[PDB]
Amino acid sequence: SETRTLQKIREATQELLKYGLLEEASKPNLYRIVLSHPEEVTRILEPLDLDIGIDEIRGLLYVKVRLDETPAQDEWAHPLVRRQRLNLEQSLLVAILRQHFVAWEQESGTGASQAQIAIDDLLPQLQIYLGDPGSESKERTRLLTLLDQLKGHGLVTSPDAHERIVIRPIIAHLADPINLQALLAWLREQIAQQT
């Protein structure tokens, strides 16, 4: 009569949805489970228009909005995606983060999600763009506020005791060549009208 999906699959898929992504070094069991039935996963999510990418070389999985039967769309407009779209202020930090991530990867390898940075290093970087309001309290406040927003999108762990943070590797799949290209195009478009 009934054909209950593998309860293990049910656990793994429901967890993965609960967090939007899923990292091996943290929760390897459901991670492997989804690796075991990526097709079943997909068909489970397909009605929802949610689809799973994969990164074995770093130990990651995650959802990403499908683009079918209402072509393309601004993905974020989907009902189920649960947060407000990134905003180029965030993106300004995002680029810096990605730079550090790839730089550390290109010298420690791809064998860990432990790409780390100290908050104070960011300060000069933003200081150039967001300027220098000359009060560490204001700038560091805004810095942590940005970081908070990002952890809301899951990209970066919040500060630890040592004022150091771990970049979540999902960052990489956000700072895509293709997506970066669409972004640079739209940004040059903005430049052309700002002038």
Structure tokens at 58: 């770093």
With contacts defined by CB under 8 A, how many residues of the chain interact with another protein? 12
Site for another protein in 100-119 (CB under 8 A): 102-103
Find, among 53, 73, 50, 69, the residue nearest to 61 by Cα. Answer: 53
Distance CA 82, CA 76 (A): 9
- Cβ proximity to another protein, 103 vs 118, nearer residue: 103
E strand or H helix at 64: strand 60-65
68 binds, among another protein, a second copy, none (CB under 5 to 8 A by kind): a second copy
| 116 contacts: CB under 8 Å, gap ≥ 6 | 104, 164, 165, 166, 167
70 belongs to the binding site for another protein (CB under 8 A): yes
Binding site for a second copy (CB under 8 A): 2, 4-5, 7, 9-11, 13-15, 17-18, 39, 42-44, 46-49, 68-69, 78-80
Q: Mark residues 15-44: x for contact with another protein by CB under 8 A, - for none.
A: -----------------x--xx--------
DSSP code, position 86 = P
Q: From the list 136, 179, 184, 190, which residue makes contact with another protein (rule: CB under 8 A)?
A: 184
Task: Give Cα 4 distance to the centre of its chain.
Answer: 32
5 belongs to the binding site for another protein (CB under 8 A): no
67 belongs to the binding site for another protein (CB under 8 A): no
- Cβ proximity to another protein, 35 vs 166, nearer residue: 35
Interior/surface letters 131-154, b for 16+ CB within 10 angstroms, e for the rest: eeeeeeeebeeebeebbebbeebb
- Cβ proximity to another protein, 80 vs 102, nearer residue: 102
- With contact defined as beta carbons under 8 Å apart, do 143 and 119 qualify? yes
Q: In angstroms, give the least distance from the CB of 21 to another protein.
A: 20
Binding site for another protein (CB under 8 A): 32, 35-36, 70, 99, 102-103, 181-182, 184-185, 188
